[PDB]
């Protein structure tokens, strides 16, 4: 139902090893479609989805000229933050930025995003009203007053309320076969004996899109959320995702444990058990 | 589509 477009940016300075490295990626929901790496021969914005290759050369020239300008601005900001935090010029530091917009089934904006981070910690972020900022410390307050004087929020508000939602809906129509149709998971339960009196049941979910899924084990109607080992949802490598959950079950009582999976591509939540 | 804006720190 809900859809989103996101752009991620990462800049890490390499003092003595050359220019700072800049890598940016774009996502429509959980699907990568554009990328740009500063450490390539003649770096240019490259496509990563079939439905984005339909854009004209003027589109690619703009996106390349935007990513190369963002890399230049990060070099100025990385040197500026050294003055703000009294840091040394011989240390490697990291600048991160993400901006994007969420839209609902109506096709209108629900939530806007724009935030920066220095060395893994928050720096300055755009509030949800798309008109104010929240600074993390007094150094970010220096940037906050400059961004308020230059009326930076007004351009972002116009972009997030306008071109972000409009071009996301364009992408959702051009990639209507892959982005608007969800792939349900393929479920099964495996059995792995640990000892004579203890065993483990593993509930699998393979090949599902998007990444949002919930795997919960249940002891006769009550969840074993404390005794359940869950792993981070991992990408399979073909734009699909995988997740599994496991429980330590006393041997002989395997039929009192049930796995419950919920996903958008599923018609109704699933209930699956170990079939011998 | 990316945003066209320059806003240095």
């Amino acid at each position: 139902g809900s859809h989103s477009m996101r752009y991620f940016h990462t800049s890490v300075s390499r003092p003595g090893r050359g220019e700072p490295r800049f890598i940016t990626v774009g996502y429509v929901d959980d699907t990568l479609f554009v990328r740009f790496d500063s450490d390539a021969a003649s770096p240019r914005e490259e496509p990563r989805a079939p439905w984005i290759e339909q854009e004209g050369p003027e589109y690619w020239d703009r996106e390349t000229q935007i990513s190369k300008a963002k890399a230049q601005t990060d070099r100025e900001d990385l040197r500026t933050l050294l003055r703000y935090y009294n840091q040394s010029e011989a240390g490697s530091h990291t600048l991160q930025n993400m901006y994007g917009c969420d839209v609902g089934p109506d096709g209108r904006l629900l939530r806007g995003y724009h935030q920066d981070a220095y060395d893994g910690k928050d720096y300055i972020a755009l509030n949800e009203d798309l008109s104010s900022w929240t600074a993390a410390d007094t150094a970010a307050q220096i940037t906050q007053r400059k961004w308020e004087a230059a009326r930076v929020a007004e351009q972002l508000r116009a972009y997030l309320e306008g071109e972000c939602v409009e071009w996301l809906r364009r992408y959702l129509e051009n990639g209507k076969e892959t982005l608007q149709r969800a792939d349900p998971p393929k479920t099964h339960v495996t059995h792995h004996p640990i000892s004579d009196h203890e065993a483990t049941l593993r509930c699998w979910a393979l090949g599902f899109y998007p990444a949002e899924i919930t795997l919960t084990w249940q002891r006769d109607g009550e969840d074993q959320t404390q005794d359940t080992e869950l792993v981070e949802t991992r990408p399979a490598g073909d734009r699909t995702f995988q997740k599994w959950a496991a429980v330590v079950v006393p041997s002989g009582e395997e039929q009192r444990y049930t796995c419950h999976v919920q996903h958008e591509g599923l018609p109704k939540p699933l209930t699956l058990r170990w079939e011998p | 589509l990316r945003v066209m804006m320059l806003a240095p720190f």
Partner: T-cell receptor
Amino acid sequence: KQEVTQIPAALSVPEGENLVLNCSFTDSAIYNLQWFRQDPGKGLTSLLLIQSSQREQTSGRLNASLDKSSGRSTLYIAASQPGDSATYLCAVSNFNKFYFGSGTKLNVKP
Amino acid sequence: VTQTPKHLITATGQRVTLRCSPRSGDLSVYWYQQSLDQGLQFLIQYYNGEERAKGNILERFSAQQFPDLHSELNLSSLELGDSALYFCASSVATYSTDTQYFGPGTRLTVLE
């Protein structure tokens, strides 16, 4: 390549009449678009700055639109006063540099 | 924004120097040339003492931004076509969401 054109060249209109000044540009990848008034002496003074993704801006009797897709901007002046008589320049900011239009001279006849 | 000089009458082959003082607190300076045949043309932009953007500035035009954020413009081997209005602009920085503030302008007339 960016080329900014402004029509008409000159304009003499009675005071109180609403005006429509047009601006066209060929390169849509712009950071913003401004409208300047040039009076002999002081020089260029900014009137409206339309952000890249903004479609309209307003300030008093001035109301300007922006459509980057078509490559068109339009400044609407409401209830023309004799003080508004000046040359009006359409400016645009691109990746490499800034481009200005030919200009539109305005004479608000009292 | 202040500029110097105000007016400037000279002959072909001579050399002039135009200086500009931006607003206090502004780190970027812009030079423009307004001629009858080409209109307002962007020359060069300096930001915090370093060159940032450049237009179709001739090789015989020399400019520089000093550490006090003031700017200089040398027009050498003057020709009749160099007769134009030379404006100086300044901005707080390189923000695409902010405007420029122009100065009064220096009028140059080059005679044979």
